[PDB]
Design a protein around this nucleic acid. Structure first.
Ligand SMILES: [Mn+2]
Ligand SMILES: [Mn+2]
Ligand SMILES: [Zn+2]
Ligand SMILES: [Zn+2]
Ligand SMILES: [Zn+2]
Ligand SMILES: [Zn+2]
Lengths: 162, 162
DNA sequence: TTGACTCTCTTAAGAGAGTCA
DNA sequence: TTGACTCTCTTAAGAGAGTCA
């Protein structure tokens, strides 16, 4: 099995490579009518992506390193968390984008949590709008707001009470 | 079926049958430390479910009627909305449980909205905790809260900024 | 050892359609 | 005509593994 030193070396090589990705400045809602700035380190749209990186789906990538003649591969956003527990409350841990930018691989924009926790950030009011996430959101979720409901609760007769 | 009269007859038959489902009272968090009461009309756990109803999945049902000698079938929660547009902004409209209770078929607990709007209600703080849904939530979402994040944003080197 | 592709799978909110009696 | 089963599909947040040179 890979040693602690070996895993740290994988994380360090990943950081070195991702740090050279194009850095894009994005202005983002924080909640409470305030605006902030995030700096995303974005993987390229097409090959080549960077040393060790390859695309396995339209918005999915993997990182690969060969150690002692054994090929090791990980989801592209999971590498910062290789020394952390991989489950919690019986649920698999997932890489969660605090910046809501899939191509971004900035580890300061990622957290490690259940898929349910991950998804819910899409609707969070944000760090200046009432976020209660213990690991705080960096921005208001892109789907926060009144919504676009087409039809609300209703009945034609009198068979029901709320 | 095709006619408005036929569609109204389908909604009326569905309401009459669902109106005879057992009414189960559920006390629910509203947000803001307050509690409310919902009355769900719950489809039975096993056959028979009611005239026109059949189970197509562990928590999925369909409603079926014969009109002009042809069988017409719909997802069991979609019937109240048969006169509404079936899409919004190019996204499919879905039946969305304001009570977060799949077996419930009370139309006073359903709305018709995109899958994203639907999902997002799971994390809403609720009608007394800050819900901003234009079609208001009936309760705080079951997944609202601080989460259980295992690891937050972090780097080993000095290549990244927020 | 490495790059650039290929394929299918998970989850939890939701769907459509066919086989028998 | 009605009932009680069977199967796979959609979405958008996420995954693992194979092939070839
Ligand atoms: Mn996410
Ligand atoms: Mn729902
Ligand atoms: Zn980012
Ligand atoms: Zn948050
Ligand atoms: Zn209900
Ligand atoms: Zn709400």
């Amino acid at each position: 099995a890979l040693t602690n030193a070996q895993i740290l070396a994988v994380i360090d090589s990943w950081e070195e490579t991702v740090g050279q990705f194009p850095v894009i400045t994005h202005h983002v809602p924080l909640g409470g009518g305030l605006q902030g700035t995030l700096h995303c380190y974005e993987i390229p749209l097409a090959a080549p992506y960077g040393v060790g990186f390859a695309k396995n789906g339209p918005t999915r990538w993997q990182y690969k390193r060969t150690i002692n003649q054994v090929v090791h591969r990980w989801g592209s956003h999971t590498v910062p968390f290789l020394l952390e527990p991989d489950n919690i409350n019986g649920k698999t841990c997932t890489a969660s984008h605090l910046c809501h930018n899939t191509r971004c691989h900035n580890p300061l924009h990622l957290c490690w949590e259940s898929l349910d926790d991950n998804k819910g950030r899409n609707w969070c009011p944000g760090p200046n709008g009432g976020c209660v996430h213990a690991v705080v959101c960096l921005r208001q979720g892109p789907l926060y707001g009144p919504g676009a409901t087409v039809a609300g609760p209703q009945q034609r007769g009198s068979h029901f009470v709320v």
